[PDB]
Symmetry: C3
């Protein structure tokens, strides 16, 4: 009985349902919790012997790395896989296309299903190559930043991967953001180009995209050229002569293969700005990609035969890591949903899952609460038997929402993964592994590989030893996918994460841990 | 008895003469036609296991490749040796210089023999490095295009290899092209620099080079700097201050070694502009690794090139023949190549044979047009010279008539040499159909069997369906892409698809009609798409018509092609005036070039 | 044996290495005896490929392997070494040592005033270099650019050089005392895109004008886009031109403590070093990357007998080739600490050098004879106050060392317990040409002794232009074939390079120095050929 961790009292462990293992296509990646603890202990005690092999296994390198791990938190010089060279678009597209070009890669569900379509890895390579050829002709090169202002669809994925192909860093801006937000982000990154579309369609409603871009770009001198996709082909949308060019017109000029550009492990893969003044969280290439592939493989128990549906927007780190990189690195299909959970009806999510026999579903608790209110009747209409792993992202999931998730969507036949992580962490920090870790509803459970979790007493600034404790959550050493800096403001990076608790990474979240070692997220501090 | 292939009836196979194998420096690369077909079948069914090893054997890689072959014709995304890195100038120059820097590389015969000279691989390395150092100081870098407007001499080769050394793509413009032609090509490629010379010498007459470049460059804003070689050192030739600089003066500033720049297999090696059925010339883009492998492979096997051999390709670098078989093929194989600046007639019609005797050339590559001209005027001169060093004779650019084939064999070859009628296009990069020297017996006038990686096929033009069985005629196509296939048309990939890939989906469209006989030999009957080959030059009737219409006095114009005794085919122009023939001949001479003028 | 020509040699007894040298050396010597030395020397001359290939792979960390050890000839000025290889100098000087042991001292910085002294570890140096390189990379500096340095001898000069190298650019270091016109001429020749400097310098207790001379030059240097200024004195009266000048601390705060290095080809230029020139125009000596670095590490290891445990103190300025090779590259490639002295030998007193040596137990000391003569005049009394037992190798650079100065050096500084290395070399040679190896070659005072690996020395008669065979000879000193660290060109003027070194005596490298060789083969440098 915990006097501090009141959540832990009288909550029974929920073993993984049998139907999960029935539906699992192959042997599990981890046999039992003990094997997990052995691997975890190695990842903490021996990051070299643990991550080196996995990095070589899960990633295709243009040049081998000579040092797995370097740098410390206090000095803000963390680096992983030093000396290595690779290209993200190759690991997400090229190698899979060569293996089997006809395998589905992007299952695109549009706002209206009539406009839905599917791209194979061969298709994705050709589109990415063409956009990258357009960008290369425009002078985009390694070390540049390219802005993306697109909804959740194929063009957002293709834009990101083409920018990566050339070695540039993409900065994805949520399509709903105001013109002033676009202005601040583009000017901070000094983007040389922008990829967007004339208009968007969401929930049946047309949305202004190119209009807001124009209103922003009048104050963004760095943007030399804009690439506009005709999502709606509305003739009234205006293109500025000498700056705005059409996606289809330009991609028609260039061939379906373009050599990728090799980049160093620690060369920046992308900037992601977080909502005060916006700050650009910078993520390297090698460390971030490994974190995405590693978490996607083990936390969700993804197998080659599987199909993932991450109901998140690329404007959010969730979309980046688990809608694009994690899945495509592992070569599995990923579902890209442009619409709203309600349009045309609140059965939209389930309609898509049944349509594509999705094996994994990843959603935020906010949508779960909305669907609890309005779409309970619609859940029963659709066939969700293909699913076996259900994920929760972005906020604490209350046990009642946990039980609702388990009953109506999972049918108490699926594993539930409550994933705790930040934009800065790149990938999962604390999460219960699918098919390995029994669940405590509302608990993120054990930390993942490379994550040495700790609880600090805020007043003393001292780590709290032992279980049955509550405090601010910190990490004792840097992990592969940890953000390396804040764009052109490394002092802010240090002051925000490294300096507040020296020797630690400060999450900004308070949490508690019970006698079983499960971590309970108490929310922001 | 062929009911369709009338050419094949009553044609006896011509085995390679015994004297060929006597003169051959070593055992042949292929034993017999049977081994050739076994290797060919492997190249078709299993291109990875066939070309992968050859690529490692014949090319020196900075980074190893992970995939031999990728992409399809239907999608226009063909790629070979993916992930590999290499440099063309290293494979053509550096490695051979290290082996033996004193080995001859460029045997340069100038328009007048007094100006002739020879460069060793060490010499070529130093000159290439110096020019590349000049270009690198000017800001030329990987991904740029550099224009070349030079005659056929050492400086053209050096300019091309220097551009390649830096990872840039060279665009060679035939020295005869008009100022307007230079303008269009430079502006299409947006070249940052141009390499040319003050004046040229051809057939004993001085020609204006820097003059035409200046006239073009007034409308070429992308050209930041020009490198001018003192071919004649005429002081009256004017250099634009701040743009024009002298070859000798600038190269003197930089050292004789410059590190080569690594490039990906599919990074573009060069642009070559070809007149098409459009009215505007199109820049054919060729990759690096695939093109180089095709050049070395075809040069080695079809011509039976050995290290001891010397090749004489009587073609201009402005033509794909010069690129592949005057420069890259030979230098990749490390053999000397003869670079002839003059004409077959100057000073006398024994000029070619004089050169062959002078350097004991083992291989000779020429277009049938020159053979017909020398047959007309220079037949007597062959006997004065010693041509015994030759064993392989090549034909390029046009169908070779059996009568010219026999003339070639009898008077030049002395019925002691192999004859290789090579069929290929600028777009193919290297040979498509040709009889391998010492391997394939010849049917005069037939290119014979297709080469490695080339899965030739005849399509019924009317139905668009592949024709099974022999003794058939149809439009010639290729069923899968090959290493040296052109990858795009510069910044216009849609024209590339519409021209080659889309007309017969799943196939490569040659634009040629051809036949296949019972023995499998292919007979090229010429273009189907109204393109005319005059004296070895591909010309578009559309471009000539547009040039005719430019003249305000002409209201309508229509141009066609017909048989010509000397140039193979001639172009005849018909004009309608609203209310002068020499003026129109000069108008097209000014619009395209002296070569494209109508007969 | 009376030498008819080599009058210096008569009556000079070989001076064997003192016993205390071997007592103090932490490990077995790199070379057993002179006989082994001559075997290796002969191999380096006859078989440079089989000799330098292995050493190059041992001492340097390569991003891409090389396919040819040696290429080109002197007569054609196309020398190239380790062709096809790729590497980064800042990685070999900083990164690899930092990963091995980040807390090992790298830069032992002794400032003009000792209170301002500090020590940077290899980990510290990695972070500082990475941050400066991040500043420069954000400014657009990239491979193929040149960056000028106008700094005194302190950490910031080393860091600036290594950061420029990290990005693949070539650094051109300018002596801090040089006039504005000198800065102008050098910057414009190189067309430098950026400049790194400080507000003011402090030398011998007095403040010195640095930023002022830079500004006066930069009004005529249109290529310089941006300036990085370090607050050495933080004098508020110092003016920065807005839109060009930015502060070292302010900018480096923006960027992270690790930056990936940029790989460059062996023969890509590592640095330009301009030489003080008689007549009008200064000439920029260009040094490759692989060849120069190997020469630095090789000479530093063998001539001075540097071991990982050792500490080196090179009393030379980075504006001089001595600072480049043996204050920065040589020691840092070998991963040993190097002492960086900002002040003068006299301030606060003439015991400053010896104070530093005792403070950090420096094992190797490298100085020019000029300082030795000055200290002989004024600072003999201070030597006795300090403990120099840590020393075992004493070096002389830049001038002929008089036998009297040699004995003074050995007795008062070395206590007749150290080896003395009279190193002969030029900016163009990159590293030592003729020098007696510590603990291997017995010394004749005033003689540079035997040539070093890869140096095939020869004497030419100026009148006949013919090599002089046999010993007891005098002539102009030349080298018969190019060596790894030989200068490759003079920036954008290769004809001047040829006319100066290659063309006067074709097939030879012309040192511009006259020298003699005695019966034992020891070389005696007699000085420049003009003025003989
Ligand atoms: C992935 C993401 O959302 N990145 S984020 O940059 O948007 O940060 C979101 C913040 O919300 C909190 N949070 C996120 N996920 C959970 C979770 N599964 N359980 C409990 N709290 C959670 C925490 O405070 C995070 O830092
Ligand atoms: C290499 C070259 O000349 N490229 S090219 O781009 O100029 O095209 C020339 C065109 O001439 C025709 N052609 C070329 N070679 C032969 C040959 N051996 N036999 C019969 N016809 C031939 C065909 O029509 C070609 O396409
Ligand atoms: C390192 C350095 O000095 N670079 S430098 O370019 O400044 O050298 C210029 C000249 O210095 C002379 N010189 C150098 N060292 C000695 C020495 N130990 N004994 C006699 N003369 C020496 C030599 O004549 C050089 O050519």
């Amino acid at each position: 009985t915990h006097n501090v961790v009141h959540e832990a009292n009288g909550v029974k462990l929920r073993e993984t349902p049998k139907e999960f293992f029935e539906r699992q296509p192959n042997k599990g990646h981890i046999h039992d919790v003990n094997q997990y603890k052995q691997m975890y202990e190695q990842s903490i005690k021996d990051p070299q012997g643990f991550f080196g092999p996995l990095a070589k296994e899960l990633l295709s390198w243009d040049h081998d790395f000579h040092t797995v791990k370097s740098g410390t938190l206090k000095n803000g010089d963390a680096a992983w896989f030093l000396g290595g060279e690779l290209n993200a678009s190759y690991n997400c597209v090229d190698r899979h296309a060569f293996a089997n070009p006809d395998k589905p890669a992007l299952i695109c569900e549009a706002d209206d299903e009539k406009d839905s379509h599917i791209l194979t890895y061969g298709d994705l390579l050709r589109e990415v190559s063409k956009v990258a050829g357009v960008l290369q002709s425009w002078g985009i090169k390694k070390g540049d930043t390219v802005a993306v202002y697109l909804p959740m669809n194929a063009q957002a994925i293709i834009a990101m991967l083409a920018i990566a192909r050339l070695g540039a860093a993409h900065s994805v801006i949520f399509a709903g953001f105001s013109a002033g937000s676009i202005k601040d982000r583009v000017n901070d990154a000094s983007c040389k180009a922008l990829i967007t579309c004339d208009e968007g369609k969401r929930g049946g409603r047309t949305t202004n995209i190119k209009k807001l871009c124009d209103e922003a770009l009048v104050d963004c001198p760095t943007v030399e050229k804009v690439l506009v996709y005709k999502r709606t082909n509305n003739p009234e949308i205006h293109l500025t002569e000498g700056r705005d060019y059409y996606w289809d017109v330009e991609t028609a000029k260039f061939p379906g293969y373009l050599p990728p550009v090799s980049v160093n492990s620690e060369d920046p893969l992308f900037l992601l700005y977080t909502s005060g003044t916006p700050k650009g969280v910078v993520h390297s290439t090698a460390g971030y990609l490994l974190g995405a592939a590693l978490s996607t493989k083990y936390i969700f128990d993804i197998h080659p035969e599987d199909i993932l549906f991450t109901a998140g927007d690329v404007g959010w780190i969730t979309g980046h890591t688990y809608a694009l990189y994690g899945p495509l690195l592992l070569g599995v299909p990923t579902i890209i949903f442009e619409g709203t959970p309600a349009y045309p009806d609140y059965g939209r999510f389930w309609q898509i899952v049944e349509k594509h026999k999705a094996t994994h579903f990843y959603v935020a608790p906010t949508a779960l609460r909305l669907l609890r209110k309005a779409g309970e009747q619609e859940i029963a209409k659709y066939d969700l038997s293909s699913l076996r792993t259900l994920g929760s992202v972005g906020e604490p999931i209350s046990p009642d929402i946990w039980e609702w998730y388990n009953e109506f969507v999972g049918k108490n036949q699926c594993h539930i993964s409550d994933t705790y992580w930040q934009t800065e962490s790149g990938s999962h920090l604390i999460a219960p592994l699918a098919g390995v870790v029994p669940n405590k509803p509302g608990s993120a459970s054990y930390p993942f590989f490379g994550i040495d979790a700790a609880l600090i007493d805020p007043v003393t600034g001292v780590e709290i030893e032992g279980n049955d404790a509550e405090g601010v959550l910190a990490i004792k050493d840097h992990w592969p996918s940890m953000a390396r800096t804040v764009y052109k403001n490394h002092t802010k990076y240090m002051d925000t994460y490294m300096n507040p608790y020296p020797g630690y990474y400060f999450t900004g979240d308070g949490a508690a841990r019970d006698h079983d070692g499960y971590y309970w997220i108490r929310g922001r501090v």
